[PDB]
Design a binder for this molecule. Structure first.
Ligand SMILES: *[C@@H]1O[C@H](CO[C@@H]2O[C@@H](C)[C@@H](O)[C@@H](O)[C@@H]2O)[C@@H](O[C@@H]2O[C@H](CO)[C@@H](O[C@@H]3O[C@H](CO)[C@@H](O)[C@H](O)[C@@H]3O)[C@H](O)[C@H]2NC(C)=O)[C@H](O)[C@H]1NC(C)=O
Ligand SMILES: *[C@@H]1O[C@H](CO)[C@@H](O[C@@H]2O[C@H](CO)[C@@H](O)[C@H](O)[C@H]2NC(C)=O)[C@H](O)[C@H]1NC(C)=O
Ligand code: NAG
Ligand code: NAG
Ligand code: NAG
Ligand code: NAG
Ligand code: NAG
Lengths: 434, 435
């Protein structure tokens, strides 16, 4: 007569769920009473719950309420089962499979622990993405939908784009659980460069029984400025350089939205000019875009001949319209007319006489006006007004020079020089006193 | 009798290499029978004996003389019998029985009562490396005002000895860092989530956040970084003042001052006008700004006053909520009257088309109004007034030309050049005829 308990074992069940205890025996003769018993809470004696008579597979319940227990003996498979239908906390006891020959008791037992049902909680949903702004760079993306801290594990995470349910490229890692029996699910939606850089409305919808309405997170992305074609602007040569240095410098300003170094190439009449292709580092701007500038110097004769100079940067517009600098048709040029006058008439004094040079009837409007006292260039007192357009289609301007009366009444020569595109040199107009 | 029970609804699980501690409790009150530990070898159905205790003795008598991997212990006081396996192997996965009998050997000792269980031996999970992901709300310059929550996720790693830490601008941050309890999937891989809550102020500032994840499967810590610039939505509106145009002052005889407020928030901007510091009633007005090519929004408010009030020297100030406190670049006042210079006019002929020139010089400030009249009729065609240019003398000067057909110049008409300036109470005239 011995009641063993394997105290290094236990059976755990959630409150309300059924328990299925089972014992295997090695007897080859069905000649003994088989019993299922349990030790009630607060005592130390094994109260009998049910038994089978030797040779009979019919359970003989003696205690409890016939409905809470379900027994089953099968001498073929050598099994004796006892099931508790709806586990309660009071069921947490020691349970024994017993064998005896008359009501010499040999029993083998274990313990039963009854855990509570975890409190149902609602999932916290978080939708995350890489930088989803306008300045978003080119590349593939991975949208993330995290749902944490919920019970039970019957959560559904779905993806939508522009109202349409998306199924491809949706990967959800295996379900997860912490020490507090709260679950965590992670869904990911992988997006190609094309779709990611377009304006779209992504949505993650999470459905859970603790929620009457699904939790919907939204990400509304505008079209990416990284797919905008680089803008090229041309800077024509300055007349100042054309008359002074007699070089001609053309400029090419390329504005991208990618900070990558920009490589510029120059073509003359379609053919690339050797030794002129050059790469420069762009410069960040106000809107976030980057801008670089390339310069190309040519001879004055080549520029005035009518050569078409084209600027090309990789991935630009095919129309060479806003990318080409060429001198205008020669029959459209108008030579500037110069008209000088003097205003601001013992004299002596610190009086100032002002000389005016009217430059009119020229095309295009780029003009260079300078003043010279004999054979010396003047910088002080010179005021060249901006060029204004004519109803005749040409342009006109005025240039003033304030000189002390000491130099005008002495008898110096005052020259107004005008350099223009339609001139092979500089057109002079002299003005002396007497 | 004689029965070998096994509670088949129970089992014991151990990781390979770790020790196993089996234990049985008995209800016998006399230490008068042999207690033994046995196990069923893999591939049979008979209980092979492993060790036994003589009745009354707590000293183990192992069946093989040497307890190598096994270590037994009986204590009849507490009625306990324990058996420990040092490093569980896969062959240790068997059925184990604590047995009681009154006589050993002799085949069928008809007093064999045994209680048994099973033992499962699991392998150590393969160590994997954590995938680290740092996430945040929109972290651009135009990021909206509000509190933020940065997230550092580390998934798919083993074992669970991972460390997630946060840094701001190189300084380790500890406050407001919350990590939910560690988590585990069916493949015994762990997942940890750390969160850093940030107040509106700190989030809207330029900062360098960092999440550092350390794990034994990593030779070098994984560091994720998020560099946010200062937000332009907390930028104070910039106010620019527009003084009245002399054109309006001479024609309409009012004086309209302008206030251009530039924010980065599209909210309607409320303007208030003060005269000599005191607010002018009826002038507070809120209007909706207009976005420009920069992301900012800009609005303009106008205030009309009498010419006498403006020219007297009253200081007019423009105020917008949450703007600069210094009223210097927010105030419009006419300059001291002794700094004004009246414009000097000099007419000439330079030119069929004859062109007349009117040189207006030595005036301050530079706002000037030039008009032409043929006797008593204002001219609009052929008039060209050049922009005002500064003098080394400190004043300003400009030219206005008029191209007229030779018929009117050679006929003998009066050609008047009118000039209105701030230093003039009317219009200064200069006539030029042929004769
Ligand atoms: C130049 O500015 C003066 C100053 O007037 C002030 O600014 C104006 C833009 C308006 O907002 C005015 O309300 C404000 O006071 C203007 O003088 C104003 O002229 C009008 C029209 O003549 C006057 O209204 C009339 O006034 C008389 C007498 O007060 C009443 O009988 C009429 O029923 C009617 O209200 C107004 O009073 C007067 N403001 C004064 C004197 O302070 C002036 O019109 C303006 N110039 C132009 C060309 O607009
Ligand atoms: C950005 O939001 C913060 C947080 O709301 C604002 O700071 C304070 O916010 C409280 C509560 O909403 C308000 O009552 C206070 O007026 C705010 N005070 C200060 C001193 O900031 C903050 O003002 C907001 N910033 C902008 C530019 O709107
Ligand atoms: C966009 O980025 C992907 C890599 O993510 C690359 O394959 C693709 O070529 C990029 N697009 C362009 C136009 O360079
Ligand atoms: C023009 O440009 C060339 C090439 O840079 C330079 O060597 C030369 O001095 C310049 N000469 C004139 C006349 O412009
Ligand atoms: C040049 O710019 C104008 C105006 O922006 C545009 O109409 C024209 O198509 C452009 N030419 C090109 C891109 O070749
Ligand atoms: C006013 O504006 C000027 C513009 O350059 C600036 O330099 C100056 O500091 C401003 N003064 C203020 C805000 O008091
Ligand atoms: C021009 O006006 C003046 C007065 O300013 C007058 O004496 C003269 O006769 C006028 N000439 C003509 C042609 O009307």
């Amino acid at each position: 007569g011995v009641n063993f308990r394997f105290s290094s074992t236990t059976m755990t069940v959630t409150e309300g769920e059924p328990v299925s205890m089972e014992c295997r025996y090695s007897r080859k003769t069905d000649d003994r009473y088989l019993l299922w018993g349990y030790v009630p809470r607060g005592t130390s004696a094994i109260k009998q719950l049910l038994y089978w008579n030797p040779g009979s597979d019919t359970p003989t319940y003696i205690s409890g309420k016939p409905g809470r227990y379900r027994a089953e003996k099968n001498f073929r498979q050598k099994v004796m089962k006892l099931q508790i239908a709806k586990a309660t906390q009071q069921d947490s006891s020691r349970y024994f499979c017993q064998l005896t020959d008359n009501l010499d008791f040999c029993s083998c037992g274990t313990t039963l622990k009854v855990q509570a049902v975890p409190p149902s909680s609602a999932p916290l949903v978080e939708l995350h993405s890489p930088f989803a702004g306008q300045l978003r760079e080119n590349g593939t993306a991975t949208l993330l939908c995290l749902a944490s801290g919920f019970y039970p594990s019957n959560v559904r995470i779905s993806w939508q784009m522009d109202g349409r349910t998306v199924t491809a490229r949706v990967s959800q890692q295996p379900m997860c659980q912490d020490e507090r029996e709260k679950y965590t699910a992670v869904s990911r939606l992988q997006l190609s460069s094309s779709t990611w850089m377009e304006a779209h409305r992504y949505q993650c919808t999470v459905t859970h029984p603790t929620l009457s309405r699904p939790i919907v997170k939204e990400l509304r992305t505008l079209a990416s400025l990284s797919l905008r074609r680089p803008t090229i602007r041309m800077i024509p040569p300055s007349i100042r350089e054309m008359v002074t240095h007699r070089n001609a410098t053309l400029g090419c300003v390329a504005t991208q939205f990618i900070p990558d170094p920009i490589t510029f190439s120059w073509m003359a009449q379609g053919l690339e000019i050797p030794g002129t292709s050059q790469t420069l580092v762009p410069t960040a701007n106000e809107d976030g875009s980057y801008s670089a500038r390339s310069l190309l110097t040519v001879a004055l004769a080549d520029w005035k001949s009518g050569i078409s100079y084209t600027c090309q940067v990789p991935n630009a517009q095919s129309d060479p319209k806003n990318r080409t600098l060429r001198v205008e048709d020669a029959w459209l040029w108008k030579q500037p007319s110069l008209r000088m006058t003097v205003i601001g008439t013992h004299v002596a004094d610190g009086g100032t006489t002002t000389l005016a040079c009217f430059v009119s009837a020229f095309y295009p409007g780029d003009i260079y006006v300078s003043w010279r006292e004999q054979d010396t260039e003047l910088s002080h007192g010179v005021t060249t007004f901006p060029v204004r357009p004519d109803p005749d289609g040409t342009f006109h301007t005025v240039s003033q020079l304030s000189v002390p009366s000491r130099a005008w009444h002495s008898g110096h020569n005052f020259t107004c020089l005008v350099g223009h595109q339609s001139l092979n040199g500089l057109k002079e107009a002299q003005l002396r006193k007497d």
